[PDB]
Amino acid sequence: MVLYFIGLGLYDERDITVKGLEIAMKCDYVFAEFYTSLMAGTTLGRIQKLIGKEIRVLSREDVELNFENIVLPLAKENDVAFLTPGDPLVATTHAELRIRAKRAGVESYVIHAPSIYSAVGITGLHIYKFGKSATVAYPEGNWFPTSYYDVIKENAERGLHTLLFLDIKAEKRMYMTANEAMELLLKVEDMKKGGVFTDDTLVVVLARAGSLNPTIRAGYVKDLIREDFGDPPHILIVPGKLHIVEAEYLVEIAGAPREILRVNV
Amino acid sequence: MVLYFIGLGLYDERDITVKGLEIAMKCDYVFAEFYTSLMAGTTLGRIQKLIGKEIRVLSREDVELNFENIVLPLAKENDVAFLTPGDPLVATTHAELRIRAKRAGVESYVIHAPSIYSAVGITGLHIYKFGKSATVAYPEGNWFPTSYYDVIKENAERGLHTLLFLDIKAEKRMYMTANEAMELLLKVEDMKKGGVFTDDTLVVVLARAGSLNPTIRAGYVKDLIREDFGDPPHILIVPGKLHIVEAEYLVEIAGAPREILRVNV
Ligand SMILES: Nc1ncnc2c1ncn2[C@@H]1O[C@H](CSCC[C@H](N)C(=O)O)[C@@H](O)[C@H]1O
Ligand code: NA
């Protein structure tokens, strides 16, 4: 009788840790959700084949409204696993599910997996230099989200890099591209006019981290806004003040304009 | 012709991903470094047994000064792997190693694994709320560094959490405990008196992330400074003002005192 929160990693079924696989293999019941992120290099079938168990996929409503009615009851008399893309507790509200587990008398354990949050390291930007993070959300009706703009502003003033998670509508199979994020940011800039995000802003795009050949690109918005970065998922990053070696990596590995080598200390 | 940067994950030999393991198994030569951090829940022997390959350990000097003449020469005509605790390229100087590979005409790929940067999500603190990160270093001789204190101050001032890495003497296998970190911060507070870290400051301690039985404790410095959090490594976090959901998790899962539900929210 136990509940395991097991991360599946960044891109495909092999991104799960050995620990996660061996534990998942011996669980009586295996549940999972695929609405918090997108694993672009695998399928439910390949995941099931790898762990050797049939996986019951749950919707956001099943989880948020009925986790304690669907999953927890089984954990009381069996070993249950709950799979999620990336790391189960990063940029999700799944941590709160551990409280529901406790209140239901069910012990829970967490098995980590590679997360987009640390995979940013492959962009060459020092991870300790990232500041507050934010999510670029799709406007809906008359509601136009903009707080993420201020996050960038706050971090940039501090010389810190800003990680921008991009929106996702799993049931509609909508995955926000870095291009759409840039478009939205320019519109917010027009309204606020804080000089935070313009055509001359340097940005970094990372697509399909976890694959052997992820797309890593850096450059000015004016030049990248219409560039094809490949299939989703994507994340957008607005660097703050760059260290010499960060700039060198962006140029050498991410194809950034050589002019950014000349940092303005 | 190929160099693989493969992360070993958080705590033991099972924290490497399935992808990481299978790739390492096919490599002709396998190198590793344990100066950035150590795998406290395992040993080199156990990692070797799992990968089924002899592993050549590299010192900080081997990597920083001679990566191109120790690792790359072999990567030119063979499949070579470079193992590092956590997620590759998280350590500040590692990204630059990919530039050396490129310059030597060696292809390089990154195989991610869990990182403490994302694993701390198990503390129930929202990942997006983390600000700039820092490392607590021991004062030595006439040198008393305190920049990590300023980092806490700037983050907390903006309602952001501060991830604090604690000093490590890898070679000597000596770790700074969360207890020592707290005492140091209290000393820096007595000197700067900026109101940033006091007996009344709420902190979170995470020990042995990655293990099935990590230690997660939250509370006021006055009560945790002499508490036993178990064996290292320890990570210290100074949260900024809490979301009620973060507070509830710290109380129910981290044993935090109910008092934080009214004082730090
Ligand atoms: N492999 C990947 N490549 C690029 N972006 C990714 C990604 N995986 C997740 N993301 C980004 O993060 C968003 C999901 S947020 C949930 C993150 C997840 N728990 C983790 O640990 O990674 C996506 O919409 C996308 O913007
Ligand atoms: Na961070």
CB pairs under 8 A between A and B: 179
B227, two tokens = 């508490």
- Is the peptide bond preceding residue B233 cis, with omega within 30 degrees of 0? yes
Q: Quick check: helix, strand or coil at residue B228?
A: coil
Q: How far is A214 from chain B (nearest CA, A)?
A: 10
Residue by residue, what is the 3-state secondary structure of B152-167?
Answer: HHHHHHCCCEEEEEEC
Residue holding tokens 């927890």? Answer: A72
Query: Are the C-beta atoms of B255 and B200 separated by less than 8 Å?
Result: no
Angle at the Cα of B195 from the Cα atoms of B194 and B198, rounded to 5 degrees: 130
> Comparing C-alpha atoms, which of A36, A54, A34, A58 is closest to residue A45?
A54
- Closest atom of ligand 1 to A206 CA is 4
Instruction: Please state at what angle helix B95-103 crosses helix B60-70, rounded to 10 degrees.
Output: 20
Helix (H) or strand (E) run with residue B7 in it: strand B2-7
Parallel, antiparallel or unpaired: strands B56-58 and B29-33: parallel
Backbone angles phi, psi at B115, to 5 degrees: -125, 150
What single-letter amino acid sits at A206? L
> Comparing C-alpha atoms, which of A49, A146, A222, A116 is closest to residue B118?
A116
Chosen for mutation from B89, B94, B106, B108 (greatest number of chain A CBs closer than 10 Å) is B89
Judge if B1-114 and B115-265 fold alike in CATH terms. Answer: no
Q: How far is B258 from chain A (nearest CA, A)?
A: 15
Residue of B nearest to A19 (CA): B14
Q: Which of A14, A50, A245 lies nearest to residue B96, judging by beta carbons?
A: A245
> Comparing C-alpha atoms, which of B230, B239, B225 is closest to residue B123?
B239
Residue A215 beta carbon below 6 angstroms from any ligand 1 atom = no
Q: Give Cα separations from B92 to A126, A262, B263 (angstroms).
A: 6, 20, 36
Query: Are the C-beta atoms of B117 and B13 separated by less than 8 Å?
Result: no
Chain B CB contacts of A16 below 8 Å: 17-18
- The CA B226 to ligand 2 mean position distance, Å, reads 28
A184, two tokens = 């939205």
Please answer yes or no on whether A165 and B253 come within 8 Å at the CB atom. no
Q: What is the CATH class of B1-114?
A: alpha beta
Ligand nearest to the CA of A208: 1
Determine whether the annotation assigns residue B87 to a binding site.
yes
Q: Which of A95, A98, A117 lies nearest to residue B118, judging by beta carbons?
A: A117
Residue A155 CB contacts under 8 Å (≥ 6 apart), including other chains:
A130, A131, A132, A161, A162, A238, A240
Please answer yes or no on whether A132 and B127 come within 8 Å at the CB atom. no
Query: Are the C-beta atoms of B34 and B115 separated by less than 8 Å?
Result: no
Residue A37 beta carbon below 6 angstroms from any ligand 1 atom = yes
Residue by residue, what is the 3-state secondary structure of chain A?
Answer: CEEEEEECECCCHHHCEHHHHHHHHCCCEEEECCCCCCCCCCCHHHHHHHHCCCCEECCHHHHHHHHHHHCHHHHCCCEEEEEECECCCCCCCCCHHHHHHHHCCCCEEEECCCCHHHHHHHHCCCHHHECCCEEECCCECCECCCHHHHHHHHHHHCCCEEEEEECEEHHHCEECCHHHHHHHHHHHHHHHCCCCCCCCCEEEEEECECECCCEEEEEEHHHHCCCCCCCCCEEEEECCCCCHHHHHHHHHCCCCCHHHHCCCC
Chain A CB contacts of B109 below 8 Å: 212-213
Chain B CB contacts of A5 below 8 Å: none
Alpha helices in B78-158 (DSSP H): 95-103, 116-119, 147-157
Q: How far is A238 from chain B (nearest CA, A)?
A: 15
The second-level CATH assignment, the architecture, of B115-265 is: 2-Layer Sandwich (3.30)
- The CA A38 to ligand 2 mean position distance, Å, reads 22
Alpha helices in chain B (DSSP H): 18-26, 44-51, 60-70, 72-77, 95-103, 116-119, 147-157, 178-192, 221-224, 244-252, 260-263
Determine whether the annotation assigns residue B115 to a binding site.
yes
> Comparing C-alpha atoms, which of B127, B252, B146, B256 is closest to residue B201?
B256
Query: Are the C-beta atoms of A242 and A168 separated by less than 8 Å?
Result: no
Q: Which of B112, B118, B245 lies nearest to residue A96, judging by beta carbons?
A: B245
Q: Kindly provide the resolution of this structure in angstroms, with one decimal.
A: 2.0
Residue A43 contacts B, CB cutoff 8 Å: no
Burial (CB count <10 Å: 0-12, 13-18, 19+), residue B113: buried
B66, two tokens = 């001679």
Give CA A64 to chain center in angstroms: 19
Question: Per-domain residue ranges for chain B?
Answer: 1-114, 115-265
A58, two tokens = 């749950």
Angle at the Cα of B40 from the Cα atoms of B5 and B256, rounded to 5 degrees: 110
Instruction: Please state at what angle helix A96-103 crosses helix B244-252, rounded to 10 degrees.
Output: 40
What single-letter amino acid sits at A110? V
Residue A106 beta carbon below 6 angstroms from any ligand 1 atom = no
Paired with A9 in beta bridges are: A86
Ligand nearest to the CA of A115: 1
